[PDB]
Amino acid sequence: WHINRTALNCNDSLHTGFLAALFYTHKFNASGCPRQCGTIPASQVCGPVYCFTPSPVVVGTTDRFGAPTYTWGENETDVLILNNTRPPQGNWFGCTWMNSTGFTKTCGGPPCCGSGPWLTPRCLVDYPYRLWHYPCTVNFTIFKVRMYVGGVEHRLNAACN
Amino acid sequence: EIELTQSPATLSVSPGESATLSCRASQSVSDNLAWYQQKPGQAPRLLIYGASSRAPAIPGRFSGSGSGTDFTLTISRLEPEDLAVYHCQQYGASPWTFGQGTKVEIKRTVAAPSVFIFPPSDEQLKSGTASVVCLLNNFYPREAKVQWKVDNALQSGNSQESVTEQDSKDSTYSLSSTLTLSKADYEKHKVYACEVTHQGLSSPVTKSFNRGE
Amino acid sequence: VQLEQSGAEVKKPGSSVKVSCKASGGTFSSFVINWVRQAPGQGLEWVGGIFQAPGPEREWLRDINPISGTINYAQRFQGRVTMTADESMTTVYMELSSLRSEDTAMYYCARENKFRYCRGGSCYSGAFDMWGQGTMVTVSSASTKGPSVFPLAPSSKSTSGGTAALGCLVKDYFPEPVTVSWNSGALTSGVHTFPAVLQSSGLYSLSSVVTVPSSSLGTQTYICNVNHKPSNTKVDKRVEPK
Ligand SMILES: *[C@@H]1O[C@H](CO)[C@@H](O[C@@H]2O[C@H](CO)[C@@H](O[C@@H]3O[C@H](CO[C@H]4O[C@H](CO[C@H]5O[C@H](CO)[C@@H](O)[C@H](O)[C@@H]5O)[C@@H](O)[C@H](O[C@H]5O[C@H](CO)[C@@H](O)[C@H](O)[C@@H]5O)[C@@H]4O)[C@@H](O)[C@H](O[C@H]4O[C@H](CO)[C@@H](O)[C@H](O)[C@@H]4O)[C@@H]3O)[C@H](O)[C@H]2NC(C)=O)[C@H](O)[C@H]1NC(C)=O
Ligand SMILES: *[C@@H]1O[C@H](CO)[C@@H](O[C@@H]2O[C@H](CO)[C@@H](O)[C@H](O[C@@H]3O[C@H](CO[C@H]4O[C@H](CO)[C@@H](O)[C@H](O)[C@@H]4O)[C@@H](O)[C@H](O)[C@@H]3O)[C@H]2NC(C)=O)[C@H](O)[C@H]1NC(C)=O
Ligand SMILES: *[C@@H]1O[C@H](CO)[C@@H](O[C@@H]2O[C@H](CO)[C@@H](O[C@@H]3O[C@H](CO[C@H]4O[C@H](CO)[C@@H](O)[C@H](O)[C@@H]4O)[C@@H](O)[C@H](O)[C@@H]3O)[C@H](O)[C@H]2NC(C)=O)[C@H](O)[C@H]1NC(C)=O
Ligand SMILES: *[C@@H]1O[C@H](CO)[C@@H](O[C@@H]2O[C@H](CO)[C@@H](O)[C@H](O)[C@H]2NC(C)=O)[C@H](O)[C@H]1NC(C)=O
Ligand SMILES: *[C@@H]1O[C@H](CO)[C@@H](O)[C@H](O)[C@H]1NC(C)=O
């Protein structure tokens, strides 16, 4: 793992400030507030990419055949192969990331209805960039939860409303 | 710090023609260069950032080009609304620095001024001072020379002048020159004349009056 | 959405001034609010910039974060300019001390987004993309004084063909601005209200002229309406032929 494996193709044309919230932890005020997981081109990605086996895991850039690349996703051939963090057993896998112009993208998700990190309509997996991708969950409460998929025990934090 | 030289200082462009502005940096600033448009009596407005990237809502006739040290702003089909001072700014190295600005005025046909002279008012004379106003109206181009003569003595250092911004429909300029004398001096003398030199005049024009006539 | 600055200020040499820049339609959060000044005829001059941090830095990206210090000042102003922001991040102030006559200038605030775009491990600015309307700061030893208004009477020496010139001389006031209208705004066409000139006395002087048909002299009434709000002086001068 290396800083350079973060895709950094970011573009805040409208001056919304979302790109600043990549570098700083920005909490929101009240006013401001499926699909399968394949392989996405790094050019459409801004900031770190998280996947959820319930448990959160980061996906770094690689080339098309999976060898790690360290060029911030600037290379046309740079991709994030989401499915290579899919654990071989268990039916739970979702991912989330920011596209280049600050829109949260999701590939579900929970087996069902929910999408990406979301576990219930009420609850999503907590991870270091939740408030960036899902700013409107800023005053979700954090619960220690435990889930079993494919027999394996996952201990994680869930943010719930 | 990084020095930004803008050239030329003034541009006169006919409507529909192109304007090419130059901005040259001492050290290299690597495409971290911006252009601003400052129309008369207004705040600067951003036209171009990153040397060639164009601010939103900016018409397509504005194009920046270059990198390193030599940058250009091109205004392709000039509209009369484009009358403004254009400023370049580098943000490649603190402190941020600006050029001295290039004034773009609208070229038009030459026009000689209408020259008017105004004696001091009696109201002002009783206050102790005499101001004599010479008015040059609606001329082009902006360069003009006013000279004051009192009984054929050349006055120097006791007048001030003001030129209007170029007129938005006329593309013309006007100029006011005020000669200031004491009341006593004013009344010691008879002939007050302003002599106007301008490219639209075959030879200097003199407008004059004789005090108290 | 828009930057609104505080009103014009007039200050004696050696004094201080504090100018505000207020956000309408939102917050300065995550922007650098810069101050740029412009002496009456001259080019633009960066004074400095203050960054409005949205929150605590995420320090795993420290090495590519483009922000170098929350507060930066041009070297010329270090020791006598202070930039602050309220805790709401809707207002940024610039306080300039030890004022000198060369500090006379229009002062602009301008928003800068240092996170306009990123590529390849660095982020780039969008330049100064939104500007306030400007706050004029006048530094002078002169004292406030309303103008004297004198007529510029039309005559044979102020006619050409069928058109005559007349005007008002607005003399010896401090500070700027004055407004002049003619006939309460009913005539605007053909009016030239010249830029004020600063006299060696420290007081300003200005003329306002208008051209009118010669056949109107002594039939049409001409009044120049002069308003000098800083001295609470309003004058209506009838201007009539010699
Ligand atoms: C943008 O991204 C591209 C990647 O898409 C990147 O290009 C790479 O650049 C690096 C650095 O220049 C190259 O690294 C060299 O690799 C040499 C070996 O190359 C052979 O092996 C590659 C890996 O093969 C494995 O994986 C494939 C895929 O699964 C598999 O098929 C193989 O069987 C094997 O398991 C292979 O990709 C590569 O293929 C290219 O070249 C062949 C033959 O020319 C051609 O037929 C292909 O079509 C393809 O174009 C090739 O078969 C390696 O020997 C070399 O090492 C030298 O230098 C180091 C350091 O000096 C020394 O330590 C060493 O001793 C040698 O002297 C070096 O590591 C890499 O090959 C490129 N990849 C490609 C696809 O071209 C760009 O650089 C990126 N650009 C930017 C801007 O960053
Ligand atoms: C990042 O992700 C966002 C969110 O998906 C991307 O923005 C979307 O991009 C897709 C592909 O371009 C667009 O389809 C979505 O926007 C548009 O959909 C419009 C429909 O609007 C209606 O109103 C217009 C009024 O003009 C009518 O003319 C239409 O017929 C519609 O009835 C359509 O007009 C547009 O042409 C366009 O297709 C867009 N959604 C949003 C929220 O903007 C974004 O592009 C991604 N960024 C990158 C660079 O990857
Ligand atoms: C992770 O991402 C980082 C940011 O993109 C990468 O840093 C880049 O590394 C490359 C290496 O090729 C640099 O490219 C070269 O930079 C050198 C700089 O040399 C100067 O400094 C040395 C050291 O003091 C000095 O000896 C020299 O005289 C120079 O003054 C240039 O000379 C080359 O022309 C070429 O540009 C990038 O500049 C560098 N960028 C940054 C922002 O650091 C890093 O390589 C990546 N890591 C991995 C593992 O790939
Ligand atoms: C950031 O996003 C904007 C909008 O998506 C991009 O704007 C485009 O810019 C190109 C080149 O200047 C134009 O040809 C397009 O028409 C623009 N799109 C529109 C309709 O706004 C911009 O290129 C992106 N990249 C950067 C670095 O700003
Ligand atoms: C969340 O709760 C906080 C803290 O009391 C409050 O300040 C904030 O405005 C709330 N955020 C929303 C989305 O209302």
Numbering used by the authors:
A (entry chain C): 420 to 452, 491 to 569, 597 to 645
B (entry chain L): 1 to 213
C (entry chain H): 2 to 52, 52a, 52b, 52c, 52d, 52e, 52f, 52g, ...
Task: Tell me, in the authors' exact words, what the paper reports.
The HCV genome encodes two structural proteins, E1 and E2, that associate to form a noncovalent heterodimer, E1E2. Potent bNAbs isolated from HCV-infected individuals predominantly target conserved epitopes in the front layer of the E2 glycoprotein. The majority of bNAbs that bind to the front layer are derived from VH1-69 genes, which are also associated with bNAbs that target conserved epitopes on influenza virus and HIV-1 envelope glycoproteins. Among bNAbs isolated from a chronically-infected individual, we found AR3X, a VH1-69-encoded antibody that included a CDRH3 with a disulfide motif and an unusually long 14-amino acid-long insertion in CDRH2.
